[PDB]
Amino acid sequence: DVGDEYEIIETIGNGAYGVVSSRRRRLTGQQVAIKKIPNAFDVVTNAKRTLRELKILKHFKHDNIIAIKDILRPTVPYGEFKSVYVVLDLMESDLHQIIHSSQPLTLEHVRYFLYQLLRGLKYMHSAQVIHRDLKPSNLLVNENCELKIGDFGMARGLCTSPAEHQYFMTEYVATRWYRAPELMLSLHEYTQAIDLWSVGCIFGEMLARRQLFPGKNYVHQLQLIMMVLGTPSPAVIQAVGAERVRAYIQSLPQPVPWETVYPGADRQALSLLGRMLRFEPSARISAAAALRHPFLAKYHDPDDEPDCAPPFDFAFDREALTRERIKEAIVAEIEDFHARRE
Ligand SMILES: CN(C)Cc1cccc(Nc2ncc(Cl)c(-c3csc(C(=O)NN4CCOCC4)c3)n2)c1
């Protein structure tokens, strides 16, 4: 599995099309995570997502974004190469376990976690990359309370051709809980503000240590969102993609203050929260401006919240590539990685 240069420790996850084990580099002793992606070239959409992920990760160099530390070279003939091994930063837990466990989660924990999330997000949005699928299970953390953003299978970027119908109908299992309203309602406004909606959801979830908008189904999700944010505005309703969603929403009979949603919460925390959770994307705060909000004064540092240049190009992802060309690009990605340190 891991060749001679690593040693396996324990399995961290096995479901889905990947195994995640913790390991140690034999020569250095550094601990890492090894992700096996089996049958990585069978399902064109899977291989596309994988190539997407490898490129996004190789592009980012940022302490709050998981880094690729090694990619195992193909140990079998090209045509026989079917399992991809990606070595990543080993983290100790994820924000979900923290929120839904027996461990401390003080307002200072919440403040520092939010700070690192928004710092990663500032660097990431400056590269024209939208994560689109943020959630506590996607935020990795260690003992010191350091946070790293991961995954990225769902990241897309700023251009949205009439591939908005693609967003119309896609699979989201338990993942509509943080899905931005513009995606729930296909408002055809797909920018980095998407992520900010989720951040708000995550923020409140740290505050009360319970999910904010836990819809049991699509319609229930919309109903929950509305019971708090109040009836959406005329313009929003008119921008909804599917006439049927519009009709249901119009066939419905006010916003509840956030001090009432989270009675007794840090004033500044709820200030930021309210700046995040709004229907109109344009009305949300940017990651950059959030980092300057009073709630984060403890950690704000303008010389240590860098943008990322150059921006990230999704052209490779936009073109329809055969299975073969996708596999070719992934192998080229591995070799390129080994061409930029090891
Ligand atoms: C030590 N342990 C008992 C506690 C624990 C619990 C959860 C996480 C971690 N740390 C960690 N460090 C590095 C990485 Cl990279 C990951 C990781 C999580 S999820 C994932 C992925 O890519 N996909 N997931 C979806 C389905 O397939 C595989 C998983 C990669 N986690 C530690």
Author numbering: 50 to 302, 305 to 393
The authors write:
Currently, the abnormal activation of RAS-RAF-MEK1/2-ERK1/2 signaling cascade has been confirmed in more than 33% of tumors, and it is considered one of the most important drivers of malignant progression, invasion, and metastasis of tumors. ERK1/2 and ERK5 have certain homology (66%) and possess many common substrates, such as c-Myc, c-Fos, RSK, etc., thus participating in the regulation of the same cellular process. By utilizing the principle of polypharmacology, we computationally designed SKLB-D18, a first-in-class molecule that selectively targets ERK1/2 and ERK5, with nanomolar potency and high specificity for both targets. The co-crystal structures revealed that SKLB-D18 occupies the ATP-binding sites of both ERK2 and ERK5 simultaneously.
The co-crystal structure of SKLB-D18 with ERK5 revealed that SKLB-D18 also occupies the ATP-binding site of ERK5, while a significant bidentate hydrogen bond is established between the 2-aminopyrimidine moiety and Met140. Furthermore, the carbonyl of amide group establishes a hydrogen bond with Lys84, and the NH of amide group forms a water-mediated hydrogen bond with Asp200. Additionally, the morpholinyl and 3-((dimethylamino)methyl)phenyl group are oriented towards the solvent regions on either side, respectively. Structural analysis revealed that the SKLB-D18 in complex with ERK1/2 establishes a more extensive interaction network compared to its binding with ERK5, as evidenced by (1) additional hydrogen bonds at the binding interface, (2) enhanced hydrophobic complementarity, and (3) optimized electrostatic interactions. The bidentate hydrogen bonds formed between the 2-aminopyrimidine scaffold and ERK1/2/5 are crucial for the stable binding. SKLB-D18 exhibits nanomolar potency against ERK1/2 and ERK5 with half-maximal inhibitory concentration (IC50) values of 38.69 ± 0.62 nM, 40.12 ± 0.95 nM and 59.72 ± 1.21 nM, respectively. The isothermal titration calorimetry (ITC) assay further confirmed the binding affinity of SKLB-D18 to ERK1/2/5, with a dissociation constant (Kd) of 126.9 nM, 209.8 nM and 468.2 nM, respectively. SKLB-D18 dose-dependently inhibited p-ERK5, with the 50 mg/kg dose showing stronger inhibition than XMD8-92 and combination therapy groups.
